[PDB]
Curated annotation (Swiss-Prot), chains A, B:
GO cellular component, one term: plasma membrane
Secretion signal span: none
Annotated region described as CH2, given as residue ranges: 1-104
Reported function: Constant region of immunoglobulin heavy chains. Immunoglobulins, also known as antibodies, are membrane-bound or secreted glycoproteins produced by B lymphocytes. In the recognition phase of humoral immunity, the membrane-bound immunoglobulins serve as receptors which, upon binding of a specific antigen, trigger the clonal expansion and differentiation of B lymphocytes into immunoglobulins-secreting plasma cells. Secreted immunoglobulins mediate the effector phase of humoral immunity, which results in the elimination of bound antigens.
Region (CH3): 105-208
Ig-like domain residues: 2-101, 110-206
Outcome recorded upon mutating D120E: In IMGT allele IGHG1*03
Keywords of the record: Adaptive immunity, Cell membrane, Chromosomal rearrangement, Disulfide bond, Glycoprotein, Immunity, Immunoglobulin, Immunoglobulin domain, Membrane, Secreted, Transmembrane, Transmembrane helix
Protein name according to UniProt: Immunoglobulin heavy constant gamma 1
Gene: IGHG1
Disease link: Multiple myeloma: A malignant tumor of plasma cells usually arising in the bone marrow and characterized by diffuse involvement of the skeletal system, hyperglobulinemia, Bence-Jones proteinuria and anemia. Complications of multiple myeloma are bone pain, hypercalcemia, renal failure and spinal cord compression. The aberrant antibodies that are produced lead to impaired humoral immunity and patients have a high prevalence of infection. Amyloidosis may develop in some patients.
Disulfide bonds: C25-C85, C131-C189
UniProt-annotated glycosylation sites, renumbered to this chain: N61
Biological source species: Homo sapiens
Length: 208, 208
């Protein structure tokens, strides 16, 4: 029989007003005989009608994968609205319902610390500037770097990691030419997270 | 239907000739109507017979979990040999095969930098010591901490993260009592990786 999986929006889509956070209802093991899937969607129990139907895909094992995509309001997802996908198909005895929402739990604001390059690293041509972001909940977060008003893009950020108190941490690493560090340029780590004031905070790092 | 997960040996087990490196094949969602699980193991397509299959354990959601453990040679694993688990159960349309092996590519030696806490973090009663381990390949690595001859426990380590030159980096975060750090105790980050000399290096950190 068919089975249903329900996926949340991307963390980063929820935190950016220009992005479209979507909840995705996915039905697998849909037979060729009875391939037609009906989707009903509910927001805090009340039905909504604006979901997008996607064309099915046959799946090598000769079953269809069938998907419905519901756009969620940024503030609805953040305020813990519950989203329910109800799937009806001829090969089911009764419809299947799956439900999802943002991670529950008291949100906690990230603490942001910057760490200069280690001394031993100045033997090398490039240096690591480190941004430690810790104590945040839930784990949805976005971290960037900038300098003299313009984005720095040669950085990598670890996934959030669960700490012992139940909150999360991560590190972001900005690589810059050691000449820029020794020359005293000013670099900043910026963080977006629902629990920050204006969902935004930034911390600078420079030689001294 | 049931699902199969295949796990590699522990980085520490492969880096020491003195330890037992094992590949583990885990089958979950084994029902009551079809409780039989048959395992076939292969090394480069040749069947092998030394696997130890465990008694099945019933799960809370009314499924069975069945584990098969295959002990392997260090020199077979570092020679990039492929290890294949084939799982058979009456409720599978076809048998499931998983394969794992050591990642291909030339080994690259990690560099290890220790980082003291940010000056802004010397306000809290706990402080974070950071170990940055970068430049290594493959991603298999073990990181621990010690002080005054005994192991530290209160640390968390990020998964390895792909850098833009194809090598990996991670951070490890050791949390310590601020007074223990102010009173001059030496802390060290210990790293094991196959491209380090005798598979081990150590970097120590103290209040400066
Ligand atoms: C016939 O062959 C098909 C071949 O696939 C089989 O189909 C599979 O059936 C499996 C169950 O039997 C099912 O397993 C579940 O997988 C999920 C996780 O699935 C994600 O990751 C998979 C592997 O990495 C992907 O292949 C999946 O496609 C899926 O990827 C995610 O898909 C999301 C929705 O499209 C997408 O989110 C959206 O992305 C867009 C932008 O792209 C927007 O941002 C939007 O906002 C998002 O919503 C994700 O980005 C995408 N992620 C990735 C990495 O690709 C797994 O969670 C689940 O098991 C878990 O169940 C719960 C939660 O669901 C969890 O709590 C449990 O702990 C448990 O681990 C299942 O294992 C497969 O997904 C599915 N494969 C596909 C492609 O559908 C059939 O089963 C075969 N039939 C038979 C009889 O064999
Ligand atoms: C009914 O109830 C059961 C039981 O809960 C459910 O079973 C679960 O189904 C999940 C999938 O649907 C599956 O989720 C996958 O988990 C893996 C990671 O698994 C490890 O980490 C988990 C926690 O993070 C643990 O729960 C697991 O037990 C597992 O722990 C590891 O186990 C290894 C085997 O022992 C061990 O390695 C060995 O350790 C020994 C120790 O002595 C030796 O060192 C040996 O040499 C080693 O080989 C590890 O140490 C141990 N690790 C830890 C941290 O404990 C996860 O990767 C996976 O996610 C992805 O899987 C593939 C990635 O390759 C990916 O492609 C997919 O897209 C997917 O996203 C899944 O999350 C659960 O693990 C599983 N739970 C258990 C206990 O088996 C059923 O699903 C339920 N059924 C229904 C219908 O509800």
């Amino acid at each position: 029989g068919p089975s249903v999986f329900l996926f949340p929006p991307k963390p980063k889509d929820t935190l950016m007003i220009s992005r479209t956070p979507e909840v995705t209802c996915v039905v697998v093991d849909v037979s060729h005989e009875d391939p037609e899937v009906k989707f009903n969607w509910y927001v805090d129990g009340v039905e909504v009608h604006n979901a997008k139907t996607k064309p099915r895909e046959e799946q090598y094992n000769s079953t269809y994968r069938v998907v419905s995509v519901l756009t969620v309001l940024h503030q609805d997802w953040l305020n813990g609205k519950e989203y329910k996908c109800k799937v009806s198909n001829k090969a089911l005895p009764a419809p299947i319902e799956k439900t999802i929402s943002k991670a529950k739990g008291q949100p906690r604001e990230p603490q942001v610390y910057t760490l200069p390059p280690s001394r031993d690293e100045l033997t090398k041509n490039q240096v690591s500037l480190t941004c430690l972001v810790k104590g945040f909940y839930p784990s949805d977060i976005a971290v960037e770097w900038e300098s003299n008003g313009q984005p720095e893009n040669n950085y990598k950020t670890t996934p959030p990691v669960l700490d012992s108190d139940g909150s999360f941490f991560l590190y972001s690493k900005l690589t810059v030419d050691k000449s820029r560090w020794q020359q005293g340029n000013v670099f900043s780590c910026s963080v977006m997270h629902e629990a920050l004031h204006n969902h935004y905070t930034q911390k600078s790092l420079s030689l001294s």
